[PDB]
């Protein structure tokens, strides 16, 4: 239905081990499609999905040029931030940035994002109005004043409402056979005895895309939220994802427990029981 494009920038200093490394990756929803790595032998924006390969030389040149410039600016910014916090030259530090757009099923912009973190902590974020900034501390206020004078917010707003949405529309059309194909999970329930009186029921979902899914156990129609172990959704390596939910039941009470599965690729939501 709805979709998103996000770019993720990480800039990492490594004192005594060369200049800071700059890595950029681009995603459409849960699919990576480009990457740039400043340590590469020949640094350039490079394809990571088939449907982006068809883009012309001016595309890869623009994306590589912007990324090369970013490599130097982020090196400047790490030096600046180290100063804002009176930090020494010995430690390694990390700027992270995420930005992009969400579009609804009509392809209209739902909202844009731009936000930054320093060493894992929120630093500065563009507000939802795409016009003002939230600075996290007095260091970030300096960055905010720099960006107001540079009209950063106006450039990002123009990008987020223009190129971001347009190219996302174009990416969704060119990769429609994968990006707009929802693969349903393969499901089943397993039974692992723990003792004479209890056993583990585990509800499995495999091979689904996109990663968004709902896996829940019920006891007598009642949700077992507190008592369900949920593993983090993990990638299979072939674009699809996996997940499981597990609950420990009194032996002999198994059939009071149901696993419920909602996913966009499912015709109908699923209800599964342990089948001995």
């Amino acid at each position: 239905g709805s979709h998103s494009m996000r770019y993720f920038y990480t800039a990492m200093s490594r004192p005594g081990r060369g200049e800071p490394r700059f890595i950029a990756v681009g995603y459409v929803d849960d699919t990576q499609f480009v990457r740039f790595d400043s340590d590469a032998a020949s640094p350039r924006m490079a394809p990571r999905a088939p449907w982006i390969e068809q883009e012309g030389p001016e595309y890869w040149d623009r994306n590589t040029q912007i990324s090369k410039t970013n490599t130097q600016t982020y090196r400047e910014s790490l030096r600046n931030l180290r100063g804002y916090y009176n930090q020494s030259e010995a430690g390694s530090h990390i700027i992270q940035r995420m930005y992009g757009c969400d579009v609804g099923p009509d392809g209209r912009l739902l909202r844009g994002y731009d936000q930054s973190a320093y060493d894992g902590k929120d630093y500065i974020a563009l507000n939802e109005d795409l016009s003002s900034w939230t600075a996290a501390d007095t260091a970030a206020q300096i960055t905010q004043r720099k960006w107001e004078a540079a009209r950063e917010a106006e450039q990002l707003r123009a990008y987020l409402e223009g190129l971001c949405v347009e190219w996302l529309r174009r990416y969704l059309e060119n990769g429609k056979e994968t990006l707009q194909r929802a693969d349903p999970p393969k499901t089943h329930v397993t039974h692992h005895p723990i003792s004479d009186h209890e056993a583990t029921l585990r509800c499995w979902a495999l091979g689904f895309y996109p990663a968004e899914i709902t896996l829940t156990w019920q006891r007598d129609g009642e949700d077992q939220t507190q008592d369900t172990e949920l593993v983090e959704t993990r990638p299979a390596g072939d674009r699809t994802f996996q997940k499981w939910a597990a609950v420990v039941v009194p032996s002999g009470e198994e059939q009071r427990y149901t696993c419920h599965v909602q996913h966009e690729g499912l015709p109908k939501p699923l209800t599964l029981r342990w089948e001995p």
């Binding site: 924006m45 623009r62 994306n63 912007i66 600016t73 720099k146 450039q155 990002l156 971001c164």
Partner: peptide, 9 residues
């Protein structure tokens, strides 16, 4: 496609 290079922090 990437946004244009932004200003330094």
């Amino acid at each position: 496609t990437v946004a244009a290079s932004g200003h330094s922090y």
